[PDB]
Design a protein around this ligand. Structure first.
Ligand SMILES: Nc1nc2c(ncn2[C@@H]2O[C@H](COP(=O)(O)OP(=O)(O)O)[C@@H](O)[C@H]2O)c(=O)[nH]1
Ligand SMILES: O=S(=O)(Nc1nc2cccc(Cl)c2s1)c1cccc(O)c1
Ligand SMILES: [Mg+2]
Length: 170
């Protein structure tokens, strides 16, 4: 009695993809994690009374031309789209990840959660209002997280599970 979910964490270099994933799985904050390391992690959790097996891919390279990137966008079921709230360029990158995923899936129906990470940092450059409006225009949830303090990390991944589960009934 268990259901599987394939999750993929994308976003620009340095936004905190690795830090978020490692906090969820190992309960510690990594400060200098080699930015080229790309690994998958499995974790079993209970969400809404369902025992779920999460298979999570922490992506390293974000290159436009990559056969392996095309393969994991084909294989993945939901996408954690991450920007850092102190890096406006990373928030502007989001549009390109969403367009890439839609292309590969040939679909509008794509499970996605927008994540504004580094919420612990006081010098914000991306207004929460702007990030909510972008999420609204995509029809997806929006969550701010801190991989440093562990704020809303479980929340972000479990919200993406709930999105996949709902899309399966449509
Ligand atoms: N203050 C703060 N720093 C973070 C947070 N998440 C990641 N970092 C730092 O930002 C840098 C890049 O994080 P990393 O997870 O390796 O980014 P990736 O390239 O997206 O995997 C590292 O020095 C992390 O410790 C956060 O929530 N708060
Ligand atoms: O051989 S893989 O298809 N393994 C994968 N493992 C996982 C785990 C969770 C979600 C997804 Cl999309 C994947 S894809 C692959 C493909 C491309 C890059 C990789 O690091 C791994
Ligand atoms: Mg990384």
């Amino acid at each position: 009695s268990m259901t599987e979910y394939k999750l993929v964490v994308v976003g620009a270099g340095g936004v905190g993809k690795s830090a978020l994933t490692i906090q969820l799985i190992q309960n510690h904050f990594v400060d200098e994690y080699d930015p080229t390391i790309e690994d998958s992690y499995r974790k079993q959790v209970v969400i809404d009374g369902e025992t779920c097996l999460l298979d999570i891919l922490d992506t390293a390279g974000q290159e436009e031309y990559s056969a392996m990137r095309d393969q994991y966008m084909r294989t993945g079921e939901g996408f954690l789209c991450v920007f850092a709230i102190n890096n406006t360029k990373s928030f502007e990158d989001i549009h390109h990840y969403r367009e890439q995923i839609k292309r590969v899936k040939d679909s509008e129906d794509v499970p996605m959660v927008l994540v504004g990470n580094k919420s612990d940092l006081p010098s914000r450059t991306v207004d929460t209002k702007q990030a909510q409006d972008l999420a609204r225009s995509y029809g997806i949830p929006f969550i701010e997280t801190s991989a440093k303090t562990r704020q809303r990390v479980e929340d972000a991944f479990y919200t993406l599970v709930r999105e996949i589960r709902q899309y399966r009934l449509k």
